[PDB]
Protein: Queuine tRNA-ribosyltransferase
Organism: Zymomonas mobilis subsp. mobilis
Amino acid sequence: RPRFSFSIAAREGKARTGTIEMKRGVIRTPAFMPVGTADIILGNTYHLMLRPGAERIAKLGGLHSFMGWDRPILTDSGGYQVMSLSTKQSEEGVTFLSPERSIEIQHLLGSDIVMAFDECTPYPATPSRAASSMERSMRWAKRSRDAFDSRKEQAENAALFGIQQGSVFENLRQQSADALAEIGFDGYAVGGLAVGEGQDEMFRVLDFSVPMLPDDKPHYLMGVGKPDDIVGAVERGIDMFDCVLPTRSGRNGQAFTWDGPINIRNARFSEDLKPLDSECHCAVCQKWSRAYIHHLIRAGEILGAMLMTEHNIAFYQQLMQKIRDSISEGRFSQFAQDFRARYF
Amino acid sequence: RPRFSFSIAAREGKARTGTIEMKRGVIRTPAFMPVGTADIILGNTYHLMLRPGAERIAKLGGLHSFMGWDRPILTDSGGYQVMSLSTKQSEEGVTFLSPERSIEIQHLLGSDIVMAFDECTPYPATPSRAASSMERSMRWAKRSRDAFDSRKEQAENAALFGIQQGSVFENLRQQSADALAEIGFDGYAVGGLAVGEGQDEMFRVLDFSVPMLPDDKPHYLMGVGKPDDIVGAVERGIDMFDCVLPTRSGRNGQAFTWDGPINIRNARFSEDLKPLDSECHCAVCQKWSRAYIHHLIRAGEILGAMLMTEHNIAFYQQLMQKIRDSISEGRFSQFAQDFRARYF
Ligand SMILES: Nc1nc2c(CCNCC3CCCCC3)c3[nH]c(NCCc4ccccc4)nc3cc2c(=O)[nH]1
Ligand SMILES: Nc1nc2c(CCNCC3CCCCC3)c3[nH]c(NCCc4ccccc4)nc3cc2c(=O)[nH]1
Ligand SMILES: [Zn+2]
Ligand SMILES: [Zn+2]
């Protein structure tokens, strides 16, 4: 396969479905990208750079070998997580990480899809602040680009995505898209959302923001989201998603179903013999009832949380497959409406 | 198959290997019986009788259906766990559970191998106290027997095991064996060990205690134990084991290997690319290194503990298979010696 190729096989309104081809494999879009601790998984740049360290992961053969995953891997650039989990900023980078070091770390980890090093602007932000932040991220984008291109193994085998900022402002989203397109990336992420703004506002921003990106490249919405977030985002032309929700939910007793999320610890499930979800083809739903998973989690059994997690991961992939088929078949708008009618 | 049949296919010194046949399946001996939350798994009588309650498990179709396990299930009688996790005693039973109620609960859960309701005498115990306790357990054994026989579905489809007490005293172990044999059970457990006495003392007690049980019935050593405990116990004529160690170890960072247990969190494993154990055929060892499992557990990832747990469960079953084959082949005493040389 090539280093990177994106082909759109079908469209419905703003929604698209197709494929990304890379040397380690094909990614069907729209795609959900789960954390690896699916066609592609997410590595944890921030964590790995601290434990065991990027150099050590390299010494150990790279993330593919480390995690026993030979398919594509995406890494974020780390600053999001530094700012929210670690901080002193400068034009150079963040002390607590610069574009160049971020790209180097992602190279050492060996990821296939590399994210430029950006600043996820805080919400809410004034126009001036949003602009200043966005402008810095675009200088950091060019630095990221240059750093990525300077490493031949990286430039020839991986792909680099640019990240749009601009907060909730249309003119800044536009300038950002402009700067990113001028530099040129393999793909474009919509950053700076899922920062506290709420779904209506996120959708409003996506309505004008996603058409500003190159149509012939994938669009990645970072950190999004609930099942209903994803459907609405795909309606607005997003192709790729990542979110910790399915795995965090699963650790905390929450399961996603076609009828909405459920809290399995609640006593109403203690004698419920139906599977987690009635339609779900996942292994968990093939074998065990809500009553047993309830039992395990209430008892503090690690098995219960693992079963919940597997189910949620599978639910998310089933959702994306249903989105892909419906777009392909020209019935995505009906699916969306049917989905929401039942989910809510 | 029949309700219950035990056949010994080969012997080596005191050690035996063979099979238990029951309606839900065959159990190869010597057998390790893991907790189900293998040819047979253990249900958790004490927990289940409290949550969701035995009657409710019955309403839900019995433990086989609840846990999605159609093979034999063993249940303990609950008093061990009441005394150590819950208490007022009487000849009637324990307030915090009597022989009759214990047997009823085990019936409601639908287990295939039912344990009589006994008292695991505390360690250390004086001869007088050990005797008084043992004598009560033997009256409770007869009550258990009668209760089990009174329920036709139980008496025709399940099996009942008697439990020897007597602490560390030979004469009391003998009287206990005598009373149990007089009542008559499908199998005989050696109770009242793994109570703080240490391996040398446990082996010393097994040396005289196991030959006192009927040779033509299975011998179950309750709550035992580490890999080296099991090998020594099989040397002394034990056929069945249960122990929380593999699952608790796995939750706490400890893995069993042919070279002894290891604490995977230790920094020495952070760059160790060997699997958990080099010989282990388990799925975990087929795919992931010590370095990654180290990483997961240090990060608090539930996946790491699940992988450790699966490995330990598999290690234990590999141990039992190696014990069975060597006894069958007449080389168990060499295996034992080779095992200990490397394990320690
Ligand atoms: N460069 C960059 N990253 C962002 C991220 C991280 C995406 N997930 C990375 C992934 C790497 C592996 C470890 C896990 C994270 C975001 N996450 C969110 N929302 C989360 C909101 C949320 C939703 C559910 C639960 C918690 C938080 N907004 C984000 C905006 C940006 C952004 O502008 N730039
Ligand atoms: N009737 C009865 N039960 C006993 C038990 C419970 C066996 N495991 C049940 C199983 C049911 C499902 C939940 C888990 C337990 C014992 N466990 C131990 N040693 C444990 C010593 C130990 C070893 C490693 C870790 C913790 C404790 N000695 C025991 C003696 C007796 C006894 O005389 N009578
Ligand atoms: Zn499922
Ligand atoms: Zn293994």
Observations:
- The interface with chain A takes residues 37, 47, 51-52, 56, 59-61, 66-68, 251, 270-271, 273, 287-289, 291-292, 295-296, 298-299, 301-303, 305-306, 309 of chain B (CB under 8 Å).
- Chain B has one domain: 1-344.
